[PDB]
Amino acid sequence: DHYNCVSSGGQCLYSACPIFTKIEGTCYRGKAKCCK
């Protein structure tokens, strides 16, 4: 979720994760990606 994503270094993005990050979980009631 958003809390864990941001606390663990990531960012919540609805569509693509930018280059040199990868999808590691979700945010926003599972509608966005946590990119780390």
Swiss-Prot record:
Function of the protein: Has bactericidal activity. May act as a ligand for C-C chemokine receptor CCR6. Positively regulates the sperm motility and bactericidal activity in a CCR6-dependent manner. Binds to CCR6 and triggers Ca2+ mobilization in the sperm which is important for its motility.
Disulfide bond entries: 5-34, 12-27, 17-35
Subcellular location: Secreted; Membrane
Chief place where the protein resides: secreted
Keyword Endoplasmic reticulum appears in the UniProt entry: no
Keywords: Antibiotic, Antimicrobial, Defensin, Disulfide bond, Membrane, Secreted, Signal
Range of the intact protein held here: 33 to 68 of 68
Molecular function GO labels: CCR6 chemokine receptor binding; identical protein binding
Family designation: Belongs to the beta-defensin family.
Quaternary structure, from the entry: Monomer. Homodimer.
Gene (UniProt): DEFB1
Tissue-by-tissue expression: Blood plasma. Sperm. Highly expressed in the lower head and midpiece of sperm. Significantly reduced levels found in the sperms of asthenozoospermia and leukocytospermia patients (at protein level).
One GO term describing the cellular component: microvesicle
Record GO biological process: antibacterial humoral response; antimicrobial humoral immune response mediated by antimicrobial peptide; calcium-mediated signaling; chemotaxis; defense response to bacterium; defense response to Gram-negative bacterium; defense response to Gram-positive bacterium; G protein-coupled receptor signaling pathway
Protein name: Beta-defensin 1
Lineage, highest ranks first: Eukaryota, Metazoa, Chordata, Craniata, Vertebrata
Native species: Homo sapiens
